[PDB]
Amino acid sequence: SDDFLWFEGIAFPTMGFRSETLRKVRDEFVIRDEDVIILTYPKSGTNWLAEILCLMHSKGDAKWIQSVPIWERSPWVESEIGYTALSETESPRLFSSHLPIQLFPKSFFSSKAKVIYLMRNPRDVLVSGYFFWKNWKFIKKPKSWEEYFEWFCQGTVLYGSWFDHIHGWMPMREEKNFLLLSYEELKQDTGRTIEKICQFLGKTLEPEELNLILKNSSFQSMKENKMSNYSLLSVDYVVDKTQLSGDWKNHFTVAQAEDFDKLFQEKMADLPRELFPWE
């Protein structure tokens, strides 16, 4: 039946989600000014950012971060457990969300809460997305990477158009409660970033703590996490236990990348070029 949980014109996973809830989230859910949400189009960096911040509160000690699945560390409001937990939870609070602007709880535009929106080069999101979602149980699947490429360049995928999703919050980049990051700068120099974060979030830590943090927060340490990699995720969620590679240039065919360039051009043309590190 459909193969996707359609809500408000947007594809959602069947398992672990619920329309009533996606609504119990927009015209019902209550956001506090002392809340933290990592805003991300799926497969853009959430897990990392999540760990980083998680490290903040733990001030380096990766003990916690290690023995707790991220969905628990930073729940997804939109999701059942996410909502279920988030609500029966004490403040302050931190959570993730892939929701496009228009689906985000209205109670946020009133409050002053702090939201971080880590944006990532779409081409790499397309790839990572592909492999990941093709191994996700109970949802339409592309018969071919050429097909997934088609789906993505039209939005016809989970959580809608990445273009859309971006165009949606960019106009909100200037608020004092919205910090816009990007994959590039989170990798090409994890230092700055962490600064802007603790800064924007309004926090400081010992030097020997910012030390311990930096350690457990660089790519390696990250792409080596048995939590930030899901690991022990119900086999019902994934089609293959092992699947649990490469840069978008190792995946985009020359024509594709080409077509995809005329795409970003036309589509993003109404925005500041400076807005995208990646070429």
Ligand X SMILES: C[C@]12CC[C@H](O)C[C@@H]1CC[C@@H]1[C@@H]2CC[C@]2(C)C(=O)CC[C@@H]12
Question: Which residues are catalytic, by number?
Answer: 98
Binding mask 214-253 for ligand X (x = CB under 6 A): ----------------x--x---x----------------
C-alpha separations of 172 from 114, 125, 166, 201 in Å:
12, 22, 10, 17
Please tell me whether residue 71 binds ligand X under the rule CB under 6 A. Answer: yes
The residues near 178 (Cβ < 8 Å, ≥ 6 apart) are 114, 115, 116, 117, 169, 172
Phi, psi of 10 (to 5 degrees): -145, 130
- Do residues 22 and 8 lie in contact, with contact meaning Cβ atoms separated by under 8 Å? yes
The residues near 77 (Cβ < 8 Å, ≥ 6 apart) are 25, 29, 37, 83, 86, 95, 96, 97, 99, 105
Establish whether 16 is an annotated binding residue. no
Please tell me whether residue 16 binds ligand X under the rule CB under 6 A. Answer: yes
Please tell me whether residue 76 binds ligand X under the rule CB under 6 A. Answer: yes
Binding mask 173-212 for ligand X (x = CB under 6 A): ----------------------------------------
Handedness of CA 157, 159, 163, 164 (dihedral sign): positive
Shortest distance (Å) from residue 48 CB to ligand X: 11
Q: Pick from 43, 73, 93, 120: which binds ligand X (CB under 6 A)? A: 43
H or E element in which residue 258 lies: helix 254-268
Q: Which stretch binds ligand X (CB under 6 A): 71-79, 117-125, 139-147, 176-184?
A: 71-79
Count of residues touching ligand X (by CB under 6 A): 14
Phi, psi of 166 (to 5 degrees): -80, -60
Nearest residue (CB) to ligand X, 47 versus 60? 47
Shortest distance (Å) from residue 143 CB to ligand X: 21
The footprint of ligand X on residues 94-133 (CB under 6 A) is: 98
* Alpha-carbon dihedral 260, 263, 265, 269, rounded to 10 degrees: -150
Which residues define the annotated binding site for 3'-phosphoadenylyl sulfate? Answer: 43-48, 120, 128, 183, 217, 222
Write out the residues near ligand X by the rule CB under 6 A.
13, 16, 42-43, 46, 71, 76, 79, 81-82, 98, 230, 233, 237
